[PDB]
Amino acid sequence: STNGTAHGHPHEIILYYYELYPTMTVVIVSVASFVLLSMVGTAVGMCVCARRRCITPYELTPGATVPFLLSLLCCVRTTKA
Amino acid sequence: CIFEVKHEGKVMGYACLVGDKVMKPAHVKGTIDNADLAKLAFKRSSKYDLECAQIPVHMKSDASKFTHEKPEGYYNWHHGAVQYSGGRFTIPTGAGKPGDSGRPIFDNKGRVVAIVLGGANEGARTALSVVTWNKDIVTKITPEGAEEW
Amino acid sequence: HTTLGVQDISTTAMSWVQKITGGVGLIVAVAALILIVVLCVSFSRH
């Protein structure tokens, strides 16, 4: 009955839900959430890695600043006063 | 510049005001026996077995400098004269015991050259295991078989 | 007849959306490895 046009884009994608369904979309949403979690985990890891890079040069004494820009947004802002 | 770490009312090691940071070996149990220093926030570093923080403005005049410059010859330390050569600091065996960690090895102009962590006994003389400055960055030299003081 | 478990079409379009997911995962995996590599460089430097 109902129409499951193509798109587009997306749009129609949700129209298919009606066609063959209960389910379908919820599983896709869960997959999307998992993807978001992977994206979030990557970012968290990246920030920790950015710390790992700024480490050593975390004690004191001139030496960046310097490479702190170009410098993955902190780097700086960080070198200074 | 030198301050003592106490644990259950007992001196475990030392803390030192070098450069603009406040150092103390990470392995040392206790808390610096100085109000101003004790309440600080230290950043541990297990690679270097170091644990630094920043010197309060009112004590910064009390720090001890440092230097990467260390030519073969004799250096000064609380128990006498250390000898540097072959990229190794040594002393007459017996002149350094557990509880000497944290003590700086000065040169003749007062610049701190290294900080003792422990020593390996190799007979007549003991090769010290120290924290020393490289081109700009900190480093740690630990002779084979060191006994952490 | 009919009735069965997918997935199925609709090709192209389907690929358009699929291609969007997983790429970022590869990126963060590569970045993770690169961070490890740099860490090892620091370890060697010490």
User: Which subunits have 3 or more CB–CB pairs within 8 Å of chain C?
Assistant: A, B
Alpha-carbon separation of residue B65 from B17, B76, B147, C45 (angstroms): 9, 14, 27, 24
Which one is catalytic: B7, B36, B46, B49? B49
Task: Count Cα atoms within 13 angstroms, Cβ side, for B65.
Answer: 8
Q: Are B117 and B131 in contact (CB under 8 A)?
A: yes
Residue among B127, B132, B123, B119 nearest B85 (CA):
B127
Our measurement of the distance from residue B2's CA atom to the centroid of its chain's CA atoms, rounded to an integer in Å, reads: 10
C44–chain B Cβ distance below 8 A for any pair? no
Closest-CA distance of chain C to residue A43, Å: 8
Residue B132 per-residue DSSP state: E
Are residues C10 and A6, on separate chains, in Cβ contact within 8 Å?
yes
Q: Are B130 and B50 in contact (CB under 8 A)?
A: no
Place of tokens 């230290």: B42
Q: How far apart are CA B56 and CA A71, in angstroms?
A: 28
Residue A39: strand, helix, or coil = helix
The side-by-side arrangement of strands in the sheet containing B50-54 is B21-22, B50-54, B43-45
Q: Are C9 and C16 in contact (CB under 8 A)?
A: no
Resolution of the model in angstroms:
5.0
Closest-CA distance of chain C to residue A74, Å: 16
Q: How far apart are CA B140 and CA B17, in angstroms?
A: 18
What backbone torsions phi and psi does residue B54 show, to the nearest 5 degrees?
-105, 140
B95 contacts: CB under 8 Å, gap ≥ 6: B79, B80, B126
Annotated active-site residue B49? The verdict is: yes
Which residues, listed in sequence order, are joined to residue B54 by a DSSP beta bridge? B21
Are residues C42 and A49, on separate chains, in Cβ contact within 8 Å?
no
Burial class (CB in 10 A: 0-12, 13-18, 19+), B112: buried
Q: Dump strand ranges (E) for B2-146.
A: 2-7, 10-16, 21-22, 31-32, 43-45, 50-54, 73-77, 80-85, 88-92, 104-106, 112-121, 125-133, 138-141
Alpha-carbon separation of residue B12 from A23, B34, C19 (angstroms): 65, 14, 60
> CA of B22: which chain A residue's CA is closest?
A59
